[PDB]
Amino acid sequence: TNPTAFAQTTRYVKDSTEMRTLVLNLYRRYLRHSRGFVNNYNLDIPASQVRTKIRQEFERQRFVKDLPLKNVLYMKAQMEFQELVNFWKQQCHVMQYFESIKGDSFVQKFLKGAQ
Amino acid sequence: MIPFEALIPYAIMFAGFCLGGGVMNSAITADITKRARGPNQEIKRNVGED
Amino acid sequence: EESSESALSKATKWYLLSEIFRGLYITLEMYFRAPYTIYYPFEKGPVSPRFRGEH
Amino acid sequence: QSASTLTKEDVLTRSVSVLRGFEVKTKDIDLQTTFVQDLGMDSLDLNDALVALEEEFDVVFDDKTANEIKTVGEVVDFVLANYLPTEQSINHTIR
Amino acid sequence: SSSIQRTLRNLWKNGFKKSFKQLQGYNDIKSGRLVGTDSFGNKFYEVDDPVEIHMRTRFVEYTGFWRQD
Amino acid sequence: VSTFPLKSDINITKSGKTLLSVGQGGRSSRTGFTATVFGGTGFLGRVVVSKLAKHGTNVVVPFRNDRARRQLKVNGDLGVVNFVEFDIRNLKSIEDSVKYSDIVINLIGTEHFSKNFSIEDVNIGAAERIAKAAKEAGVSRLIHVSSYNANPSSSSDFYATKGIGEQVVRDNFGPDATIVRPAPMYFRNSPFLNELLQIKALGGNVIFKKEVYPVHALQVGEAIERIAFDDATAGQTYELFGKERYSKKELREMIKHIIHIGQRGYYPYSAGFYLPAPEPFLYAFALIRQYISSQPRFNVDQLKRSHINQEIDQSAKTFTDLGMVPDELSEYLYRYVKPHISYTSQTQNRTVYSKEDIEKLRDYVNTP
Amino acid sequence: YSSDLPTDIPVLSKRPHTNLLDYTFTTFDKMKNWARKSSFWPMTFGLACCAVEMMHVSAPRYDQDRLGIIFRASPRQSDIMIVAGTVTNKMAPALRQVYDQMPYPRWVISMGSCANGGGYYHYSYSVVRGVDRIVPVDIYVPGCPPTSEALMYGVFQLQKKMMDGQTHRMWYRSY
Amino acid sequence: MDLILLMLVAVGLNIIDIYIMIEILIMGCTVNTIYSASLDNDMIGLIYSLIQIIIAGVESAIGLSILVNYNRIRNSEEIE
Amino acid sequence: ATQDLPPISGYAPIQWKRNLPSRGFRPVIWFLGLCTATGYGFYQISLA
Amino acid sequence: MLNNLFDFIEYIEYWLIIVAFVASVLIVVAYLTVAERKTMGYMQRRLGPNAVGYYGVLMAVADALKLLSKEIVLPHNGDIIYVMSGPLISLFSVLLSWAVIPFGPGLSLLDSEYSIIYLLASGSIGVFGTVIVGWMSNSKYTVLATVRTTAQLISYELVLTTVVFIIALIVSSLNINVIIESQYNIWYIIPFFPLCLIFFISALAETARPPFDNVEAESELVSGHMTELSASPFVIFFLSEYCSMVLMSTLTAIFFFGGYLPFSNTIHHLILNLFDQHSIYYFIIEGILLSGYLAIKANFFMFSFVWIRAAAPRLRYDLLILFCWYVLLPIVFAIVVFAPGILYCFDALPVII
Numbered sequence A: 001t002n003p004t005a006f007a008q009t010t011r012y013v014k015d016s017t018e019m020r021t022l023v024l025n026l027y028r029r030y031l032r033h034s035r036g037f038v039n040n041y042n043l044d045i046p047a048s049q050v051r052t053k054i055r056q057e058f059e060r061q062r063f064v065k066d067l068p069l070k071n072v073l074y075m076k077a078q079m080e081f082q083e084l085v086n087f088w089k090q091q092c093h094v095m096q097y098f099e100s101i102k103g104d105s106f107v108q109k110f111l112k113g114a115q
Numbered sequence B: 001m002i003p004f005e006a007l008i009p010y011a012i013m014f015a016g017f018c019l020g021g022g023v024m025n026s027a028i029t030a031d032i033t034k035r036a037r038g039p040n041q042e043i044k045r046n047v048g049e050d
Numbered sequence C: 001e002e003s004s005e006s007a008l009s010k011a012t013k014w015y016l017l018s019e020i021f022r023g024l025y026i027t028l029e030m031y032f033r034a035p036y037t038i039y040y041p042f043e044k045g046p047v048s049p050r051f052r053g054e055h
Numbered sequence D: 001q002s003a004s005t006l007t008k009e010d011v012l013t014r015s016v017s018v019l020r021g022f023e024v025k026t027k028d029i030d031l032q033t034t035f036v037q038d039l040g041m042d043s044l045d046l047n048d049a050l051v052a053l054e055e056e057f058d059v060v061f062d063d064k065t066a067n068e069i070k071t072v073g074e075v076v077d078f079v080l081a082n083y084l085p086t087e088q089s090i091n092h093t094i095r
Numbered sequence E: 001s002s003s004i005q006r007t008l009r010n011l012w013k014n015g016f017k018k019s020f021k022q023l024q025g026y027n028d029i030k031s032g033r034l035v036g037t038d039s040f041g042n043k044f045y046e047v048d049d050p051v052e053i054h055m056r057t058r059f060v061e062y063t064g065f066w067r068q069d
Numbered sequence F: 001v002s003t004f005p006l007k008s009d010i011n012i013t014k015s016g017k018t019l020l021s022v023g024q025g026g027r028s029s030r031t032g033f034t035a036t037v038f039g040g041t042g043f044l045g046r047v048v049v050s051k052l053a054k055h056g057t058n059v060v061v062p063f064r065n066d067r068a069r070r071q072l073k074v075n076g077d078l079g080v081v082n083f084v085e086f087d088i089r090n091l092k093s094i095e096d097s098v099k100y101s102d103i104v105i106n107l108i109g110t111e112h113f114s115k116n117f118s119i120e121d122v123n124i125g126a127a128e129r130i131a132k133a134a135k136e137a138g139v140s141r142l143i144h145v146s147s148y149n150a151n152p153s154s155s156s157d158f159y160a161t162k163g164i165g166e167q168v169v170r171d172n173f174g175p176d177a178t179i180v181r182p183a184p185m186y187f188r189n190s191p192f193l194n195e196l197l198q199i200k201a202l203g204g205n206v207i208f209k210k211e212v213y214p215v216h217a218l219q220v221g222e223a224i225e226r227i228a229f230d231d232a233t234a235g236q237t238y239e240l241f242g243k244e245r246y247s248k249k250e251l252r253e254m255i256k257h258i259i260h261i262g263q264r265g266y267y268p269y270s271a272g273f274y275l276p277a278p279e280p281f282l283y284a285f286a287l288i289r290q291y292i293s294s295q296p297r298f299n300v301d302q303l304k305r306s307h308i309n310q311e312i313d314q315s316a317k318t319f320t321d322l323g324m325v326p327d328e329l330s331e332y333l334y335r336y337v338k339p340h341i342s343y344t345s346q347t348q349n350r351t352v353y354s355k356e357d358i359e360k361l362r363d364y365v366n367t368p
Numbered sequence G: 001y002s003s004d005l006p007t008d009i010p011v012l013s014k015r016p017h018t019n020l021l022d023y024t025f026t027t028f029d030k031m032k033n034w035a036r037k038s039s040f041w042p043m044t045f046g047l048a049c050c051a052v053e054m055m056h057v058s059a060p061r062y063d064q065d066r067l068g069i070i071f072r073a074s075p076r077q078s079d080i081m082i083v084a085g086t087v088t089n090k091m092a093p094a095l096r097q098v099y100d101q102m103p104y105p106r107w108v109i110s111m112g113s114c115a116n117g118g119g120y121y122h123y124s125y126s127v128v129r130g131v132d133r134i135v136p137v138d139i140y141v142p143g144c145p146p147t148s149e150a151l152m153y154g155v156f157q158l159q160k161k162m163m164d165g166q167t168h169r170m171w172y173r174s175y
Numbered sequence H: 001m002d003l004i005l006l007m008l009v010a011v012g013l014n015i016i017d018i019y020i021m022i023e024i025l026i027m028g029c030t031v032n033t034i035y036s037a038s039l040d041n042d043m044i045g046l047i048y049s050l051i052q053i054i055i056a057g058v059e060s061a062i063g064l065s066i067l068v069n070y071n072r073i074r075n076s077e078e079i080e
Numbered sequence I: 001a002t003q004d005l006p007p008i009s010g011y012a013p014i015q016w017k018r019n020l021p022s023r024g025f026r027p028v029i030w031f032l033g034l035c036t037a038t039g040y041g042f043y044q045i046s047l048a
Numbered sequence J: 001m002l003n004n005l006f007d008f009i010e011y012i013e014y015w016l017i018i019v020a021f022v023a024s025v026l027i028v029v030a031y032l033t034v035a036e037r038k039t040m041g042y043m044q045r046r047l048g049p050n051a052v053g054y055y056g057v058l059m060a061v062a063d064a065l066k067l068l069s070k071e072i073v074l075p076h077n078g079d080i081i082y083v084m085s086g087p088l089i090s091l092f093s094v095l096l097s098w099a100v101i102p103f104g105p106g107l108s109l110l111d112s113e114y115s116i117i118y119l120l121a122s123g124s125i126g127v128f129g130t131v132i133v134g135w136m137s138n139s140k141y142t143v144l145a146t147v148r149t150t151a152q153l154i155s156y157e158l159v160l161t162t163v164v165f166i167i168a169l170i171v172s173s174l175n176i177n178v179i180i181e182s183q184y185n186i187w188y189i190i191p192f193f194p195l196c197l198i199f200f201i202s203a204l205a206e207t208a209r210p211p212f213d214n215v216e217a218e219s220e221l222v223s224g225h226m227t228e229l230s231a232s233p234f235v236i237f238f239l240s241e242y243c244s245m246v247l248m249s250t251l252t253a254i255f256f257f258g259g260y261l262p263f264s265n266t267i268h269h270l271i272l273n274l275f276d277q278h279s280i281y282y283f284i285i286e287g288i289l290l291s292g293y294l295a296i297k298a299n300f301f302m303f304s305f306v307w308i309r310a311a312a313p314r315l316r317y318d319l320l321i322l323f324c325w326y327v328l329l330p331i332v333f334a335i336v337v338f339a340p341g342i343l344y345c346f347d348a349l350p351v352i353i
């Protein structure tokens, strides 16, 4: 058998320096394919907004220290990339991904039953 | 056991051909014979007794 | 060279579609048998006392 | 046809404009201008610039080069040596 | 069970009025012995015809002429 | 939208009922309210009914078209959406719709007339009848949606009947009736944008010169939701319009570039994009199709309204009185004309017009 | 700009025929309703064990083809959508897209407990609790699975509702 | 209009569009042969017309194969 | 008596082995008839 | 009135003759769709349509009326040119091919010495109209079906054309009526039994009928070129495909079973001797009789179209290409040399008379 397009073999990285390079390479691939994401998924936003969204997700995991968490985060980030480029995700899922987003006071929540 | 219900559409298809042939053979032959009777309408349509 | 049929025997079954014509004949036999269809809702398929339906 | 028409002055000029649209410390960009020191780009800003410079020149930096790039002049050198016009259909050339 | 002899035989037994009703809802002209009639008015019949197939020995006549529920 | 459209879990209606809410606001939740949306199968009713049913408000949708109402049931959970076969010439059916509702929303209104109903029957006769039937049934809140240029003394038979309908709603239901005056509404399958997106628009040199303040249909549907669930909005008139003023000539030309019909220098002129005609011909053709065509075409009264521009009543309340910011057509124009773009289909690269790009295109359109 | 509206005119489904045009558009409606009921072309959308019973309706014992029922592969040639099987979250967008591509008039039949409300898999993380959360449903056929006769009865109910359509008399008397 | 070479605008911008022009141009010669042969009641002209049609179809196939192989050369990697 | 059981003598044996016996003439005969028909056909065409 | 009314019928008479000709062909095509399901149903031990009209006689009417009452799917109202031009070319091609079919001696709308060429030329246009549906279309199943239509056309076109040319060579004429009348003493089924099989095999491939239904393979390409077609564009293509089945069945009866010639000359004379030839009723009966002979033979081959569909599985089109080019073409080109050699040996080269 052969792997699908844009598939990477799973490997457990044991070097933080080597892990950092692999993350930066993948981050570039997300930016390069940003215009492809707008084309395939027929998004209503420019590719510039897509690249901004990509950076935010990479900035969330900027300060993760543990190496085992880095590998699982990296592996899951590769799977998502292979999913987007190959057009396996349905267009509704990608549209809702950009649909994501001031908290009320104590009394405001108290009046409506709070959470 | 001959299924007569299955043979009904073939009977209508058979009558489809017979409709075309029955009309074409008679309508065309009559018109050719009618127009061969004479040089005007009073001879083509009317039939003399003699 | 180790076949049991002559060249003309195998070519006659081949060119004249021997087994294809047999399959047509088997199909034509079914044309003269009683069909299985029942006329729902005027007729109902068999049911058993163990049947599970509306509560 | 299938050959580059790039000069060192044009590639530098187009590189400076694409780098000017970012949030850099200084707008005075030359070949010796470093990304980390002079312009002040962290890990993510640098790769945003590289992809931006990719789209401008229709080139793709290799992973080995991109991780090790320091100066603006290195980018201009890379574009001049690696740029190729994209292949056209069988009708664009002969017709 | 699909022959025209069976249909003409059943057509003669039922009469035109009953057979035309079967020609409108049943799609098949059929005859049988009256077995009963329920409280809604349906008439239930059983067939002694030797050429009837297994699951077709019992059938209903509905009260309506255009729709049967 | 939001996650819970209420400021509290208890709401006492002005009719005296106390309605409690259960759940966090999903499909399985309830708000305790029963609402009746007249004209729910229409363009705006589908927006309004969807917003009410998604949060658990029981919606009674009186219908005359059996096929058009089927898609409304998907909006709410089991038992939330209810249908009543009705006619404005039938009084028993109208009472049955409002018999249990605490809120009645009236979206019934036409710009045309037909063999069975005139503009006076619908924009006045129906509105008056529904308001009175609502009052006899003890409905706490009535919401009536007129047009943007409602005026009892207007030259347009649509603007006049809409203006009179505002008066009769208050004269029957009382001073507490709420009135909404939406501007031309843009959305998917929007009647406002549909005529601009049509190719063979005859007599556009006259029809498309009207200026308006178009407003997002989702906000108009959102505003009505705010009004029904806030009793401080009773007896008030709301003018719901966008901040920017557009003329249909500008939008018609802006749309042309987004649809890329101008990619060919000949095709728009050959395909009938421009169909100039003298106004008397536009009058005769509109008059003729009023007694020959069976489908509502551009009628005589819409020809008159093409000259009248939208006038904002300054004494009425706006979106800011409801604590909402109006949307901008520049930020929504592309995605609603996106279905009509010819080739698209990831051919080479989509031209996604951002909010900034739409305004840049508007200047280019206005440049001679 | 005065008006005067009648008060006791019955609804369309209960309005009798008064003049000649009431009979003319009723005849126009009946012929079109007769054809659509007669040419009942469902779309092949068998998802799970409820599809086996749908295949047995086409089997010689029941032979839906004798009623004019033909299964079409493409949504363009179909006017009935029979949801026979569990609708999962991974399948729901595909199901909605397939439904949206049917030209009107279109009807939807929901067959079996999975499509009706989730059934055995109601409390599953990957199951839609009823196909009527995604598409409008005209009739619900119960059972796990519904028998072939139970499905045929559901079709007969839909054909009965289709024969009551008054689309062209609606234009005459309601518009 | 002919002397300013208006026909150069009517020919499409693909190599296959040049092939169609050649077929149309040759077909003009055959129509002229058929027209003259019929007026003269001469079967030698119609024999000529038949020869032109067969020969014109031969070069259409030979030219197509060259264009077919030309496109194959571009799609030569064929790593699949 | 209270359970479904096979008869004391058991059930008669059934047929389960393949039963598709060959039918028709030998291929030589079919070829000869084809040549016989072709020869007679062209004889009538020749006469006409 | 009177005289003006009577000779106005004479002014419109031939149009009614054409309307009756069109009506007769459409009745067979409409009820072939019913007959196929009835024939397949009983072979499959079901009934087939018997609930739409009395015993199922209105099933064809319901299918057309329901499809004619459906919305047409297209991106825009002005995009009718895309998915309507193809169906019309296919329908006009097969309908024009019926102009040369004689229901009796001289009863063809078009009679000419090149009726055979017109028949082959007209049907070749229908092949073009089918491929137009995949006009740079974004539907991959329509695109995949267009490729297979061309592959099948290359397969059958040479064999079907050459077979008809051998029949025309035996009579030395390209007039269809002359070919029918040349079969008085012998039906070409006996001298050319191999060619009748090859003609029918070619007809199955031309009409995209199973076992050569690789174009509209439901299990492979959902609906083939019809996957995007709904309402009127679907009826026209469906109507033209079943018109082609009737045409090729009637051509099988013409080229090999004597066309309209009677099965029994003795019985044909017995039936016609009851009617006076000086009365118009003789020519009605003769027209019914001769067309009945053609109808009976064509009904059997329309039955055979349904019969082969219910017995044989589908064959891949790449195997169809090898079958037509390696097997059928060498055999047919052998007979095109065989037949003139036999006739010359016995001094029986054909002439037109």
Ligand SMILES: NC(=O)C1=CN([C@@H]2O[C@H](COP(=O)(O)OP(=O)(O)OC[C@H]3O[C@@H](n4cnc5c(N)ncnc54)[C@H](OP(=O)(O)O)[C@@H]3O)[C@@H](O)[C@H]2O)C=CC1
Residues within 6 Å of the ligand: F038, F039, F040, F041, F042, F043, F044, F045, F063, F064, F065, F068, F087, F088, F107, F108, F109, F110, F111, F117, F122, F145, F146, F147, F148, F182, F183, F184, F185, F186, F191, F192
């Ligand atoms: N750009 C816009 O759309 C504007 C809207 N408005 C007003 O907002 C309201 C909502 O209209 P909208 O949804 O946008 O588009 P619609 O034209 O679909 O609104 C008409 C609604 O009222 C119903 N209706 C009309 N006449 C009758 C009648 N005799 N009997 C029963 N029902 C009738 C219709 O029922 P059915 O669906 O069954 O036909 C429909 O639901 C209208 O009253 C309109 O005048 C005013 C300014 C701008």
Ligand SMILES: CCCCCCCCCCCC(=O)OC[C@H](COP(=O)(O)OCC[N+](C)(C)C)OC(=O)CCCCCCCCCCC
Residues within 6 Å of the ligand: C012, C013, C014, C016, C017, C018, C019, C021, C022, C024, C025, I022, I023, I024, I025, I026, I027, I030
């Ligand atoms: C008359 C015109 C119509 C039919 C023309 C063509 C018929 C077949 C010719 C080739 C036969 C062949 O090649 O024969 C080869 C085979 C058998 O030979 P085997 O395998 O060695 O037998 C083994 C040894 N035995 C000889 C002891 C049995 O025969 C067949 O399978 C004959 C099948 C015919 C039955 C169906 C008849 C109706 C078909 C449908 C018609 C519309």
Ligand SMILES: CCCCCCCCCCCC(=O)OC[C@H](COP(=O)(O)OCC[N+](C)(C)C)OC(=O)CCCCCCCCCCC
Residues within 6 Å of the ligand: E066, E067, G030, G031, G034, G163, G164, J061
């Ligand atoms: C011109 C274009 C081509 C022709 C197209 C023809 C298509 C076929 C027509 C559709 C059939 C249809 O509609 O008949 C089916 C309908 C459906 O009845 P239902 O809905 O169940 O209610 C009816 C039953 N009730 C009311 C008790 C519940 O029966 C009818 O009501 C038929 C009754 C009227 C019969 C009048 C006959 C007058 C003579 C006509 C012949 C000269």
Ligand SMILES: CCCCCCCCCCCC(=O)OC[C@H](COP(=O)(O)OCC[N+](C)(C)C)OC(=O)CCCCCCCCCCC
Residues within 6 Å of the ligand: C014, C015, C016, C017, C020, J193, J194, J195, J197, J198, J200, J201, J211, J304, J308, J312, J315, J319, J323, J327, J331
């Ligand atoms: C000279 C006298 C000429 C005889 C005239 C007839 C010629 C026919 C040639 C057939 C050859 C063949 O069937 O070829 C088979 C080819 C390829 O098969 P293959 O891959 O080579 O395997 C077979 C080779 N073996 C067995 C030696 C290993 O494809 C097929 O399966 C074609 C199937 C055609 C069926 C069409 C149905 C028609 C029904 C007709 C009802 C009226």
Ligand code: SF4
Residues within 6 Å of the ligand: G048, G049, G050, G051, G084, G085, G086, G111, G112, G113, G114, G115, G119, G120, G143, G144, G145, G146
């Ligand atoms: S409802 Fe029952 S039979 Fe139907 S798909 Fe679900 S589990 Fe299977």
